[PDB]
Amino acid sequence: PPLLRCLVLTGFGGYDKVKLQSRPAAPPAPGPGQLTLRLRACGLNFADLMARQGLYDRLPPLPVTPGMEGAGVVIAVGEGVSDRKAGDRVMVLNRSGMWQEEVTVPSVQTFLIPEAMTFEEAAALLVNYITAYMVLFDFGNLQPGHSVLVHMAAGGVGMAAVQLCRTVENVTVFGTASASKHEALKENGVTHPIDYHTTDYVDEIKKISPKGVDIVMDPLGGSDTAKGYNLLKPMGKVVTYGMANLLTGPKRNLMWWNQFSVTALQLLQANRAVCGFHLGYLDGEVELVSGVVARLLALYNQGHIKPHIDSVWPFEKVADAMKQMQEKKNVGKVLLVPGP
Amino acid sequence: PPLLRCLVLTGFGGYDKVKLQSRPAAPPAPGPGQLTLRLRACGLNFADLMARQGLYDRLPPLPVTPGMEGAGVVIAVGEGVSDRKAGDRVMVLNRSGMWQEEVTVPSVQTFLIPEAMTFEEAAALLVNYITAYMVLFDFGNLQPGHSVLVHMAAGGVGMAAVQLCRTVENVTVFGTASASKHEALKENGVTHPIDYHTTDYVDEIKKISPKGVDIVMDPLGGSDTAKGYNLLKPMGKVVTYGMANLLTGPKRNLMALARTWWNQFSVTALQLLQANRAVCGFHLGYLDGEVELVSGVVARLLALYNQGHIKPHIDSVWPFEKVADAMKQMQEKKNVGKVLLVPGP
């Protein structure tokens, strides 16, 4: 059968909203500035779960193919495209459409993969490590001697942040994950693993550092964000980049009053900083993202970062992939493949 | 009868509340770790104008001698102090007490003045340049190719920030001040001068850079803070370090419970997350006690000075008896650079 497979989001809601639909195998004809490519692997992000629940404000109208990060092979390029050609391995960063067999994207949103890196590391590199880099360095301005709190240090962005913190001299890493992963945390580079499930991490951090930490990374959101503000040392920065507490909390069917708010004078008198980052709402900045991608690839070629994979799932098991992240059962990156 | 002169803030209100008093010149006896020194010059900041109207929460109870930075000669060394000796030219950064002829301060809060540097430039260096360095780099994370909005670019902190931006390559600096000072801006390193009194600086910036700027420095506060938030590029940071919008009407006491919520910019976590901006707050007055941080910053600043990369510009120096004429000089925003104080007539 000369058909292509695609994952489509017909409605907003639970895991069942992602359906497998067919398409008429057609000859690739990307327009000017475009690029048709077949996908080898796809990444699963928390922004994907936010979009599936309807909380991505820049999502195209339904029905639409989900997926924001992919990795595959260029099959064709349109007129005016000289930086890319057929057969090149590329990492794609988009707003939607990455969870299918074949996709046509703007060539500006693709980046060539260096050799010796598999597609699995490539699909596990873009979103997580770009977010960790831009949170730690662009906003957090990570320096030697600093102290960092990394929430969900076992997750993809968490492990990425731990590895990136190991690149800076004398960085105290506070990692939060289940006790079953604590050992692995110390393997990943975490200095003090803390289990937020049994005890309150604020006191566990205050007993080791009474004044707090320099940087706080908050993919949790809600109440924890407030906590992250009060754990800040002078010149400290709390950077929120996710809503894990919303999708991992007791209400996995959302219906939060714990939204943190601050005034300008409160920050002026506390000498603290609040930051918001989300790669989905950032595209359009050519140099801003290209420099980060280049520095990440250079760090990779020096053997200093290596995306770890937790599990790979076919399209037919996309649900089993998403729940794998929803119940926080993943150690690494959850991937999708368009395989039978 | 040799006596020492002091400036004492006796009440909250107009310029008349800061009065010049005197005391007997007792022999200097600094305690352990202390240092007694006679001040040649003292720096006037906007925090002092806030304190005179009661807006400086960390100010000691009245009556108190205000002033955060001074520059003079060490006259007595307390016990345990070995890095300092008599005759040393030092600039000192404290929370209060610097508007007088003699001070006994912790030696760890003083720094040796370079020989090629005058006392006036020394008393004009610490507060403004420390604020500019920590705003642009610690919070703003200034990088080459960035764009910075420097409000009150003719002020002390503003000129310090412009000089500090000129050390990073290809930094476009937007400065807002009245036209009468625009010339002084362009030589200092401002790329696009803007008159906030005759033009709307937001759209004036957007005409040159439609996506905004990378860093915003807000000494104005209030509604302007909100504007600084809406001029931020992706990954942009707005750093508030003053409340110049409130410091009009120098004769009233500005303490109010409504200072906490009225015209106060507020933001939520999701609002910052959906955008790609950050909101920062800084105030050196609410920051003392951490000597290692500030000492590293001061060492870097003195290196930059000796390399000819920064130059403290002086607007005017005033005797103590004209402290009022000093304060209005900064309160009416007629100064280009630093307004200083000198003890003697």
Side-chain angles (χ1 to χ4, degrees), chain A residues 1-73 75-254 258-340, chain B:
Chain A
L3 43 78
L4 301 163
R5 302 151 46 194
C6 34
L7 282 183
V8 189
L9 184 71
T10 56
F12 293 133
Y15 69 96
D16 53 331
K17 303 311 175 189
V18 188
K19 312 209 179 66
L20 176 56
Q21 298 195 353
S22 94
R23 208 162 84 193
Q34 290 301 109
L35 188 147
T36 306
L37 73 146
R38 292 287 183 108
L39 280 143
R40 289 263 201 273
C42 321
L44 201 145
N45 303 114
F46 273 97
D48 298 314
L49 306 178
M50 297 287 287
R52 183 200 69 184
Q53 228 76 17
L55 294 175
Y56 189 50
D57 295 11
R58 303 195 181 183
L59 185 79
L62 304 183
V64 72
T65 290
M68 298 185 183
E69 49 170 345
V73 169
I75 296 299
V77 175
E79 259 174 349
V81 175
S82 178
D83 56 308
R84 308 276 188 270
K85 52 178 297 178
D88 278 330
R89 312 186 316 139
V90 292
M91 271 157 329
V92 184
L93 181 45
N94 204 24
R95 312 205 156 160
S96 57
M98 300 304 103
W99 290 2
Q100 44 188 327
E101 278 197 336
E102 183 177 309
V103 66
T104 302
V105 296
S107 188
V108 202
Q109 297 282 125
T110 75
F111 314 98
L112 300 165
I113 311 179
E115 27 193 49
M117 176 198 274
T118 184
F119 288 104
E120 301 164 359
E121 300 157 314
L125 177 82
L126 277 198
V127 173
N128 297 352
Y129 279 82
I130 279 174
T131 296
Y133 184 93
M134 299 192 116
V135 160
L136 283 170
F137 300 117
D138 282 346
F139 271 152
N141 198 11
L142 178 60
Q143 307 294 327
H146 267 183
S147 311
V148 192
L149 166 60
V150 180
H151 281 298
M152 306 166 77
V157 184
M159 298 185 69
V162 170
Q163 296 177 16
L164 290 179
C165 288
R166 295 231 310 134
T167 76
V168 187
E169 200 94 40
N170 296 12
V171 172
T172 303
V173 174
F174 290 88
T176 72
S178 303
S180 63
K181 311 166 179 176
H182 275 187
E183 290 210 306
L185 280 194
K186 198 139 305 308
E187 172 272 323
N188 194 229
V190 178
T191 314
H192 306 112
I194 296 182
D195 198 333
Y196 46 53
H197 289 132
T198 79
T199 172
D200 162 80
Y201 57 89
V202 181
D203 287 90
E204 286 300 321
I205 293 178
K206 286 292 193 175
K207 73 161 53 56
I208 296 187
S209 166
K211 292 307 141 187
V213 303
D214 307 86
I215 305 181
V216 167
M217 300 180 58
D218 173 58
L220 309 182
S223 84
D224 289 345
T225 297
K227 306 188 180 71
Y229 175 74
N230 292 127
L231 278 172
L232 282 184
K233 286 192 277 184
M235 314 310 296
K237 298 99 171 183
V238 47
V239 192
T240 167
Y241 53 95
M243 288 280 283
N245 274 345
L246 179 76
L247 294 154
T248 64
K251 299 302 159 295
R252 272 197 268 272
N253 315 326
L254 328 169
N258 277 316
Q259 274 310 299
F260 182 70
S261 90
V262 73
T263 51
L265 214 82
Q266 183 181 353
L267 294 174
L268 185 144
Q269 297 205 0
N271 284 278
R272 299 179 174 174
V274 287
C275 328
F277 175 83
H278 207 276
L279 190 54
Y281 305 96
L282 196 64
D283 280 295
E285 288 289 306
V286 300
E287 319 289 341
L288 184 85
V289 193
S290 280
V292 174
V293 170
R295 298 195 189 110
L296 278 184
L297 290 187
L299 264 52
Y300 178 79
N301 298 324
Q302 274 104 64
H304 291 170
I305 62 178
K306 201 209 72 171
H308 180 56
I309 312 301
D310 172 76
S311 54
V312 181
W313 308 82
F315 278 1
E316 311 85 46
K317 293 191 180 60
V318 52
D320 304 297
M322 299 194 289
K323 277 162 289 186
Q324 185 73 15
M325 180 196 262
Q326 284 212 256
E327 284 122 6
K328 298 197 297 295
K329 295 183 300 180
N330 61 282
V331 180
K333 178 77 165 204
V334 185
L335 291 179
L336 267 67
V337 283
Chain B
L3 281 68
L4 300 169
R5 323 152 88 235
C6 312
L7 281 185
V8 183
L9 176 65
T10 56
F12 294 135
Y15 309 117
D16 43 329
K17 296 311 176 197
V18 178
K19 312 200 176 68
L20 168 63
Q21 304 184 2
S22 305
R23 94 176 137 88
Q34 281 186 338
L35 259 189
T36 307
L37 63 153
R38 298 286 186 84
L39 297 196
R40 301 278 188 263
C42 322
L44 198 131
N45 307 285
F46 276 94
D48 308 321
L49 310 174
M50 295 158 38
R52 200 199 68 247
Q53 300 208 238
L55 293 185
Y56 186 44
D57 283 358
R58 305 301 278 265
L59 183 74
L62 301 189
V64 73
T65 290
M68 285 177 45
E69 52 178 335
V73 181
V74 166
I75 75 167
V77 178
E79 188 197 55
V81 176
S82 49
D83 57 328
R84 305 276 186 270
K85 56 172 178 298
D88 294 3
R89 308 160 79 245
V90 294
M91 33 181 164
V92 50
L93 173 65
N94 209 23
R95 208 72 74 88
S96 67
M98 296 299 104
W99 288 8
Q100 58 182 317
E101 208 162 3
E102 190 186 79
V103 279
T104 298
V105 290
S107 168
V108 84
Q109 300 183 215
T110 72
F111 310 91
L112 298 172
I113 298 176
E115 189 50 65
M117 189 197 290
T118 70
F119 285 111
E120 294 168 14
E121 293 158 312
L125 180 83
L126 288 185
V127 165
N128 294 157
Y129 284 80
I130 281 169
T131 312
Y133 187 96
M134 304 208 63
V135 157
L136 291 167
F137 297 113
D138 206 325
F139 275 148
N141 195 16
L142 180 65
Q143 308 292 330
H146 275 186
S147 45
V148 182
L149 168 55
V150 184
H151 287 299
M152 271 200 56
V157 53
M159 292 195 71
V162 174
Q163 295 177 12
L164 287 184
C165 275
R166 251 194 164 165
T167 81
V168 188
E169 294 303 319
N170 190 28
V171 177
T172 302
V173 180
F174 295 84
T176 67
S178 65
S180 60
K181 311 166 184 169
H182 277 193
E183 299 146 322
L185 269 55
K186 305 222 71 176
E187 212 286 325
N188 204 35
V190 181
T191 309
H192 309 285
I194 296 184
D195 195 335
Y196 51 40
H197 286 136
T198 68
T199 64
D200 164 62
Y201 61 90
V202 165
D203 278 297
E204 291 290 351
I205 287 163
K206 292 257 164 178
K207 287 180 189 177
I208 303 171
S209 173
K211 46 181 184 173
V213 302
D214 293 297
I215 302 182
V216 169
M217 304 179 59
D218 174 43
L220 314 177
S223 315
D224 285 318
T225 299
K227 296 184 183 175
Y229 175 81
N230 295 124
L231 271 174
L232 283 184
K233 277 196 273 181
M235 309 311 293
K237 306 96 168 178
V238 46
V239 198
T240 312
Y241 57 102
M243 51 190 75
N245 274 330
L246 286 176
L247 298 167
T248 80
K251 317 194 175 190
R252 217 171 179 90
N253 176 12
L254 297 166
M255 314 153 107
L257 184 66
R259 297 273 84 86
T260 61
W261 58 267
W262 191 77
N263 212 21
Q264 275 305 306
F265 184 62
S266 174
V267 76
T268 74
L270 280 186
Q271 185 174 5
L272 291 179
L273 187 136
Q274 292 210 259
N276 280 275
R277 302 165 175 173
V279 175
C280 309
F282 180 85
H283 203 281
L284 193 50
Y286 299 81
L287 194 76
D288 282 75
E290 287 76 10
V291 187
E292 313 88 326
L293 169 48
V294 190
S295 65
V297 173
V298 164
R300 184 111 57 172
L301 285 172
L302 287 180
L304 277 175
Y305 178 79
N306 288 321
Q307 296 179 4
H309 299 165
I310 57 181
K311 39 150 289 291
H313 183 243
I314 313 295
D315 173 67
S316 54
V317 317
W318 308 72
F320 281 174
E321 57 260 49
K322 308 308 174 185
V323 53
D325 298 316
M327 293 189 278
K328 61 98 184 153
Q329 170 73 8
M330 186 173 287
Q331 285 217 215
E332 298 167 2
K333 302 190 220 304
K334 289 304 113 212
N335 62 291
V336 176
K338 184 83 175 178
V339 183
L340 292 170
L341 282 169
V342 292

mmCIF file of all heavy atoms in Angstrom, chain A residues 163-189:
data_model
loop_
_atom_site.group_PDB
_atom_site.id
_atom_site.type_symbol
_atom_site.label_atom_id
_atom_site.label_comp_id
_atom_site.label_asym_id
_atom_site.label_seq_id
_atom_site.Cartn_x
_atom_site.Cartn_y
_atom_site.Cartn_z
ATOM 1 N N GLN A 163 24.198 17.206 33.371
ATOM 2 C CA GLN A 163 25.392 17.073 32.544
ATOM 3 C C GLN A 163 25.974 18.436 32.191
ATOM 4 O O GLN A 163 27.199 18.612 32.184
ATOM 5 C CB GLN A 163 25.069 16.275 31.282
ATOM 6 C CG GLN A 163 24.656 14.840 31.558
ATOM 7 C CD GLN A 163 24.261 14.098 30.300
ATOM 8 O OE1 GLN A 163 24.554 14.540 29.189
ATOM 9 N NE2 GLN A 163 23.588 12.966 30.466
ATOM 10 N N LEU A 164 25.114 19.416 31.902
ATOM 11 C CA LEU A 164 25.608 20.752 31.583
ATOM 12 C C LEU A 164 26.222 21.430 32.799
ATOM 13 O O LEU A 164 27.155 22.230 32.661
ATOM 14 C CB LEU A 164 24.476 21.603 31.009
ATOM 15 C CG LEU A 164 23.999 21.199 29.615
ATOM 16 C CD1 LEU A 164 22.857 22.086 29.158
ATOM 17 C CD2 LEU A 164 25.150 21.258 28.628
ATOM 18 N N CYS A 165 25.713 21.129 33.995
ATOM 19 C CA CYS A 165 26.307 21.657 35.216
ATOM 20 C C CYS A 165 27.659 21.025 35.490
ATOM 21 O O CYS A 165 28.534 21.669 36.078
ATOM 22 C CB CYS A 165 25.373 21.424 36.401
ATOM 23 S SG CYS A 165 23.903 22.464 36.398
ATOM 24 N N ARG A 166 27.846 19.767 35.083
ATOM 25 C CA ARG A 166 29.153 19.144 35.244
ATOM 26 C C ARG A 166 30.212 19.789 34.359
ATOM 27 O O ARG A 166 31.407 19.593 34.606
ATOM 28 C CB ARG A 166 29.064 17.647 34.952
ATOM 29 C CG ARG A 166 28.197 16.888 35.940
ATOM 30 C CD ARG A 166 28.920 15.670 36.494
ATOM 31 N NE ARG A 166 29.512 14.852 35.440
ATOM 32 C CZ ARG A 166 30.752 14.374 35.472
ATOM 33 N NH1 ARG A 166 31.537 14.627 36.509
ATOM 34 N NH2 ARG A 166 31.205 13.637 34.468
ATOM 35 N N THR A 167 29.809 20.562 33.347
ATOM 36 C CA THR A 167 30.778 21.229 32.486
ATOM 37 C C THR A 167 31.370 22.477 33.123
ATOM 38 O O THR A 167 32.397 22.972 32.645
ATOM 39 C CB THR A 167 30.141 21.608 31.145
ATOM 40 O OG1 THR A 167 29.296 22.751 31.321
ATOM 41 C CG2 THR A 167 29.320 20.455 30.598
ATOM 42 N N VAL A 168 30.754 22.996 34.176
ATOM 43 C CA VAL A 168 31.232 24.191 34.857
ATOM 44 C C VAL A 168 31.933 23.770 36.139
ATOM 45 O O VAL A 168 31.500 22.832 36.821
ATOM 46 C CB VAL A 168 30.072 25.167 35.139
ATOM 47 C CG1 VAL A 168 30.599 26.480 35.695
ATOM 48 C CG2 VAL A 168 29.266 25.405 33.871
ATOM 49 N N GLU A 169 33.025 24.457 36.463
ATOM 50 C CA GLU A 169 33.864 24.062 37.586
ATOM 51 C C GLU A 169 33.165 24.334 38.913
ATOM 52 O O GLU A 169 32.611 25.416 39.122
ATOM 53 C CB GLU A 169 35.193 24.812 37.532
ATOM 54 C CG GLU A 169 36.309 24.160 38.324
ATOM 55 C CD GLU A 169 37.158 23.240 37.473
ATOM 56 O OE1 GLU A 169 37.446 23.600 36.313
ATOM 57 O OE2 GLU A 169 37.536 22.156 37.963
ATOM 58 N N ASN A 170 33.193 23.346 39.807
ATOM 59 C CA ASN A 170 32.731 23.499 41.188
ATOM 60 C C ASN A 170 31.277 23.971 41.243
ATOM 61 O O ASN A 170 30.963 25.056 41.737
ATOM 62 C CB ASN A 170 33.646 24.455 41.962
ATOM 63 C CG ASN A 170 35.055 23.929 42.095
ATOM 64 O OD1 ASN A 170 35.434 22.960 41.439
ATOM 65 N ND2 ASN A 170 35.846 24.568 42.949
ATOM 66 N N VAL A 171 30.383 23.135 40.727
ATOM 67 C CA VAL A 171 28.955 23.428 40.710
ATOM 68 C C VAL A 171 28.247 22.407 41.588
ATOM 69 O O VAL A 171 28.277 21.204 41.297
ATOM 70 C CB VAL A 171 28.387 23.423 39.284
ATOM 71 C CG1 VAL A 171 26.874 23.528 39.321
ATOM 72 C CG2 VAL A 171 28.975 24.569 38.488
ATOM 73 N N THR A 172 27.618 22.887 42.659
ATOM 74 C CA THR A 172 26.841 22.033 43.548
ATOM 75 C C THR A 172 25.465 21.793 42.938
ATOM 76 O O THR A 172 24.702 22.741 42.724
ATOM 77 C CB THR A 172 26.708 22.675 44.927
ATOM 78 O OG1 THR A 172 28.011 22.933 45.466
ATOM 79 C CG2 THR A 172 25.947 21.754 45.870
ATOM 80 N N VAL A 173 25.149 20.531 42.665
ATOM 81 C CA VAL A 173 23.913 20.154 41.990
ATOM 82 C C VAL A 173 22.979 19.523 43.010
ATOM 83 O O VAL A 173 23.324 18.516 43.642
ATOM 84 C CB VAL A 173 24.178 19.194 40.819
ATOM 85 C CG1 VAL A 173 22.865 18.702 40.230
ATOM 86 C CG2 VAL A 173 25.027 19.873 39.755
ATOM 87 N N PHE A 174 21.801 20.114 43.176
ATOM 88 C CA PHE A 174 20.726 19.529 43.964
ATOM 89 C C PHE A 174 19.740 18.870 43.008
ATOM 90 O O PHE A 174 19.134 19.551 42.172
ATOM 91 C CB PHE A 174 20.029 20.582 44.822
ATOM 92 C CG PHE A 174 20.870 21.095 45.953
ATOM 93 C CD1 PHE A 174 21.728 22.164 45.765
ATOM 94 C CD2 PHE A 174 20.802 20.507 47.204
ATOM 95 C CE1 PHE A 174 22.504 22.640 46.805
ATOM 96 C CE2 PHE A 174 21.574 20.978 48.250
ATOM 97 C CZ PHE A 174 22.426 22.046 48.049
ATOM 98 N N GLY A 175 19.588 17.561 43.124
ATOM 99 C CA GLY A 175 18.736 16.795 42.226
ATOM 100 C C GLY A 175 17.571 16.175 42.970
ATOM 101 O O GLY A 175 17.741 15.636 44.066
ATOM 102 N N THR A 176 16.388 16.253 42.366
ATOM 103 C CA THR A 176 15.166 15.731 42.962
ATOM 104 C C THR A 176 14.603 14.639 42.063
ATOM 105 O O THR A 176 14.353 14.874 40.876
ATOM 106 C CB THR A 176 14.134 16.838 43.170
ATOM 107 O OG1 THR A 176 13.593 17.233 41.905
ATOM 108 C CG2 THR A 176 14.765 18.042 43.850
ATOM 109 N N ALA A 177 14.403 13.455 42.633
ATOM 110 C CA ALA A 177 13.848 12.310 41.920
ATOM 111 C C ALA A 177 13.475 11.261 42.960
ATOM 112 O O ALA A 177 13.706 11.443 44.162
ATOM 113 C CB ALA A 177 14.833 11.756 40.888
ATOM 114 N N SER A 178 12.892 10.162 42.493
ATOM 115 C CA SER A 178 12.543 9.069 43.385
ATOM 116 C C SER A 178 13.801 8.407 43.934
ATOM 117 O O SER A 178 14.863 8.422 43.306
ATOM 118 C CB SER A 178 11.681 8.039 42.656
ATOM 119 O OG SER A 178 10.519 8.641 42.115
ATOM 120 N N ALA A 179 13.672 7.823 45.130
ATOM 121 C CA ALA A 179 14.816 7.172 45.762
ATOM 122 C C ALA A 179 15.355 6.040 44.898
ATOM 123 O O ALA A 179 16.570 5.809 44.849
ATOM 124 C CB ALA A 179 14.426 6.653 47.148
ATOM 125 N N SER A 180 14.463 5.336 44.194
ATOM 126 C CA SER A 180 14.877 4.260 43.300
ATOM 127 C C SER A 180 15.854 4.734 42.234
ATOM 128 O O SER A 180 16.594 3.915 41.680
ATOM 129 C CB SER A 180 13.649 3.635 42.633
ATOM 130 O OG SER A 180 12.979 4.580 41.818
ATOM 131 N N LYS A 181 15.873 6.030 41.934
ATOM 132 C CA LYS A 181 16.789 6.591 40.955
ATOM 133 C C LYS A 181 17.937 7.360 41.587
ATOM 134 O O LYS A 181 18.841 7.800 40.866
ATOM 135 C CB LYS A 181 16.026 7.511 39.993
ATOM 136 C CG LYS A 181 14.762 6.895 39.417
ATOM 137 C CD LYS A 181 13.894 7.953 38.756
ATOM 138 C CE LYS A 181 12.632 7.351 38.156
ATOM 139 N NZ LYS A 181 11.733 8.399 37.601
ATOM 140 N N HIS A 182 17.932 7.519 42.916
ATOM 141 C CA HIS A 182 18.914 8.376 43.576
ATOM 142 C C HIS A 182 20.340 7.963 43.230
ATOM 143 O O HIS A 182 21.173 8.808 42.883
ATOM 144 C CB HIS A 182 18.694 8.348 45.089
ATOM 145 C CG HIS A 182 17.666 9.326 45.567
ATOM 146 N ND1 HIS A 182 17.428 9.561 46.904
ATOM 147 C CD2 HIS A 182 16.818 10.132 44.885
ATOM 148 C CE1 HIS A 182 16.475 10.468 47.025
ATOM 149 N NE2 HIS A 182 16.087 10.830 45.816
ATOM 150 N N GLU A 183 20.634 6.663 43.319
ATOM 151 C CA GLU A 183 21.951 6.171 42.927
ATOM 152 C C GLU A 183 22.298 6.619 41.513
ATOM 153 O O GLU A 183 23.360 7.207 41.276
ATOM 154 C CB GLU A 183 21.993 4.646 43.035
ATOM 155 C CG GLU A 183 21.974 4.125 44.461
ATOM 156 C CD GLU A 183 22.705 2.804 44.606
ATOM 157 O OE1 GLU A 183 22.377 1.854 43.862
ATOM 158 O OE2 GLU A 183 23.611 2.714 45.462
ATOM 159 N N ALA A 184 21.389 6.373 40.564
ATOM 160 C CA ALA A 184 21.617 6.800 39.189
ATOM 161 C C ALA A 184 21.855 8.303 39.115
ATOM 162 O O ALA A 184 22.668 8.771 38.309
ATOM 163 C CB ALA A 184 20.434 6.395 38.310
ATOM 164 N N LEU A 185 21.166 9.071 39.963
ATOM 165 C CA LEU A 185 21.405 10.509 40.022
ATOM 166 C C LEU A 185 22.869 10.797 40.326
ATOM 167 O O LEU A 185 23.520 11.577 39.621
ATOM 168 C CB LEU A 185 20.500 11.151 41.072
ATOM 169 C CG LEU A 185 19.050 11.420 40.670
ATOM 170 C CD1 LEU A 185 18.390 12.354 41.672
ATOM 171 C CD2 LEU A 185 18.972 11.988 39.262
ATOM 172 N N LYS A 186 23.413 10.148 41.360
ATOM 173 C CA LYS A 186 24.827 10.326 41.665
ATOM 174 C C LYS A 186 25.697 9.847 40.513
ATOM 175 O O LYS A 186 26.797 10.369 40.305
ATOM 176 C CB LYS A 186 25.187 9.589 42.952
ATOM 177 C CG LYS A 186 26.494 10.048 43.572
ATOM 178 C CD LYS A 186 26.381 10.152 45.083
ATOM 179 C CE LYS A 186 25.225 11.048 45.486
ATOM 180 N NZ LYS A 186 25.287 12.372 44.807
ATOM 181 N N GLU A 187 25.214 8.865 39.749
ATOM 182 C CA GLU A 187 25.924 8.464 38.542
ATOM 183 C C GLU A 187 25.867 9.561 37.489
ATOM 184 O O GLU A 187 26.867 9.842 36.819
ATOM 185 C CB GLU A 187 25.337 7.158 38.004
ATOM 186 C CG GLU A 187 25.866 6.743 36.642
ATOM 187 C CD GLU A 187 25.070 7.343 35.503
ATOM 188 O OE1 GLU A 187 23.834 7.463 35.642
ATOM 189 O OE2 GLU A 187 25.681 7.712 34.479
ATOM 190 N N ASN A 188 24.704 10.198 37.335
ATOM 191 C CA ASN A 188 24.554 11.240 36.328
ATOM 192 C C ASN A 188 25.336 12.498 36.681
ATOM 193 O O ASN A 188 25.630 13.298 35.788
ATOM 194 C CB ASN A 188 23.073 11.571 36.136
ATOM 195 C CG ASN A 188 22.814 12.386 34.886
ATOM 196 O OD1 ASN A 188 22.127 13.407 34.926
ATOM 197 N ND2 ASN A 188 23.366 11.941 33.764
ATOM 198 N N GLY A 189 25.680 12.686 37.953
ATOM 199 C CA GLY A 189 26.460 13.836 38.363
ATOM 200 C C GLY A 189 25.812 14.652 39.462
ATOM 201 O O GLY A 189 26.288 15.740 39.799
#
